[PDB]
Amino acid sequence: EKNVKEITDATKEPYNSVVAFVGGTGVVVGKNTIVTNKHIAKSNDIFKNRVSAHHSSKGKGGGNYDVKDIVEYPGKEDLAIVHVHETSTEGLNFNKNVSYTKFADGAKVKDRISVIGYPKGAQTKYKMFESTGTINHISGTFMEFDAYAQPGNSGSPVLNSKHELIGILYAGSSEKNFGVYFTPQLKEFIQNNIEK
């Protein structure tokens, strides 16, 4: 599928749970706590580099938050937790400026989904886009879906028809894309690593 629309104002749920890194996307799951891919989290460590809360072309910021630390999932899955410092250098509070996306607790093949993130962000001044498609395969922590995606979509939340989080995109092949599918085990890892 290629139905891709810009979200010009991402101050509303669920778009206000989406975050921009240099080089890709993440999603907010709880207090000070973001989920993304390993390379997105890790690389952003080299330049260690702020995250922008739901950047969009027309919404009120957001705010841009310094990364406190990361927790990489111990297994092969392309999953990392990123903690931010709650208060931005402009005095905005992360938790007052985002929402926490709820878990879907799984999905079925043929389910209609949305991938939301920042394809070609460096070229678009980090416009947020939502791309719709279908789940084509689920196996363990692996899923495939056909929502159109590009460089910049790494770490993008894949949401179900109720705005709940099924997993995150990690790879293309494109309209043939791969994600980390959140099994109970992955959900537990994420939840155990949300700040109190």
Residue with tokens 């979509």: 153
- Helix, strand, or coil (residue 108): coil
Catalytic residues, by residue number, are 39, 78, 154
Contacts of 69 (CB under 8 A, 6+ apart): 82, 83
Count of C-beta atoms within a 10 Å radius of residue 8: 12
Cα–Cα separations (whole angstroms), residue 185 to 77, 119, 127, 144, 157:
11, 29, 33, 19, 18
Angle 160-65-103 from CA coordinates, rounded to 5°? 20
Domains in the chain with CATH codes: 1-10+102-196 (2.40.10.10), 11-101 (2.40.10.10)
CA atoms within 13 A on the CB side of 145: 33
- Listed residue (26, 23, 1, 21) closest to 131, CA to CA: 1
Q: By what technique were these coordinates determined?
A: X-ray
**d(Cα 113, Cα 129) in Å, to the nearest integer?**
14
Burial of 84 (0-12, 13-18, 19+ CB in 10 A): buried
**d(Cα 56, Cα 120) in Å, to the nearest integer?**
13
